[PDB]
Amino acid sequence: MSELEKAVVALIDVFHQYSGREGDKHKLKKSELKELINNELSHFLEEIKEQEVVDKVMETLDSDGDGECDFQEFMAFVAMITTACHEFFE
Amino acid sequence: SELEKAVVALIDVFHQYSGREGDKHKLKKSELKELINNELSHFLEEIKEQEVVDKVMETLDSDGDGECDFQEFMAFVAMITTACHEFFE
């Protein structure tokens, strides 16, 4: 695969990894969203060490309101990060 | 991490193709066509007609400026990734 294709695959891969740990296997609960951020985005986002912060992060990302982050909400999260970085460099 | 590498790859591939012609920060039809044909060949059928690149740009150009900017590109990446995730469930 091309670099863009591996990137597409990794996003699906990483979401699946964290979402399939607890509860709903197709969604990220707070604990799952926290660890994904802490382990996998450690160079982009400040490590989450407060319950208020993980609550705020989930409130921001959960557009439908079921208290978890589904794949579509996760892709919206990836879009903000990538777009912010792109706007910075270009 | 793998997610971080993916974020960087998305920014780089867009920059790569957008920076060929015209506005270096956007994809014109020719740039978008080449990105799809060269970089997404295992997921999308190769574009071989003008009518197809015209319709693809029409779909992705949410603002109407005739080109695909980065957020429009991410919406595109989002379409593909979501489609594949939904495939497994």
Ligand SMILES: *c1c2c(OC)c(OC)ccc2c2ccc3cc4c(cc3c2[n+]1C)OCO4
């Ligand atoms: C998803 C994938 C993945 O991502 C997990 C992998 O992992 C090895 C393999 C293949 C695919 C896809 C295969 C075909 C396909 C076709 C179309 C898509 C998306 C895919 C795949 N996505 C990228 O969108 C429109 O047609």
Ligand SMILES: [Ca+2]
């Ligand atoms: Ca879960």
Ligand SMILES: [Ca+2]
């Ligand atoms: Ca949700």
Ligand SMILES: [Ca+2]
């Ligand atoms: Ca361009």
Ligand SMILES: [Ca+2]
């Ligand atoms: Ca546009």
